[PDB]
Design a protein around this ligand. Sequence first.
Ligand code: HEM
Ligand SMILES: [N+]
Length: 291
Amino acid sequence: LVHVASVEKGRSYEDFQKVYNAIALKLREDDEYDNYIGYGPVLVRLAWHISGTWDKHDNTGGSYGGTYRFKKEFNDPSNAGLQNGFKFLEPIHKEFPWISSGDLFSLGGVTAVQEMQGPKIPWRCGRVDTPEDTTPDNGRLPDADKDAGYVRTFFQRLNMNDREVVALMGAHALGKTHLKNSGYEGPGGAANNVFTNEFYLNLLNEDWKLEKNDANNEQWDSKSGYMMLPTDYSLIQDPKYLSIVKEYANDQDKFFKDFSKAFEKLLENGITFPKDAPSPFIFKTLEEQGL
Ligand code: HEM
Ligand SMILES: [N+]
């Protein structure tokens, strides 16, 4: 496969800025969701899930085709709970029907991050909806009960190195796990709706205990009442991972820079941008626009 990016006919920056602004305004208004967490975390997770199905070997999956919209991918067990992000975006799509799906789903994750005070994430338009048949089978998303080796190996399929893996996982500071969705329960820190390097600090500073949960799965629990999945814990078991965790616990900036690049790469994987495509856009937050 070759997935060339094709800009939505006749739209420019300003058009995209408006879709961004609509998502952002709705994030603000629907602040009750998940006990006051808001939808930010879930959008972030949706954007990662539609992008994580990519396979560097044959170029299948990835954000391109917006296949999440199809039954198969939508009903993927690893996708349980994402339907709420979907439902949240639907009205937006209805208002701006010329945006493709992969573009919409991906822009929500970007909007979410920047609106939760994260770093700016450059973003490119151009994804094109593909047919139901381009939909990847389930089982391409990672399990949570493994270790560092597993994680290393898995991410490799997406071309991500150690530094990218560690940066990207710091998104685990957002939201929380939900029993019903994944068989895991609890938040990972205190600031679960603001973007910070809290994840790294908690892994390093808490006194984690391994326990089973009501779903009969193991998780690392802290006295403060926080949790970490085995895959998150594994970041401190591997020596290479561990020094990067340390770097981030110590420098929020470094982390923000690295996350930003890694997030973009993740969202751009498998897509070919012609020389004449426009440069990546950098959207203003509602606040920078005084809205
Ligand atoms: C080894 C890799 C990964 C594993 C196994 C993992 C597993 C999961 C699971 C089990 C959940 C909770 C689902 C629920 O019960 O609602 C979680 C939530 C979430 N994940 Fe990951 N995921 C990983 C990587 C990623 C990365 C790369 C990102 C984004 C960069 C992502 C962002 C999030 C967010 C923001 C949430 C919270 C969702 C909410 O509050 O509803 N995770 N992840
Ligand atoms: N989380």
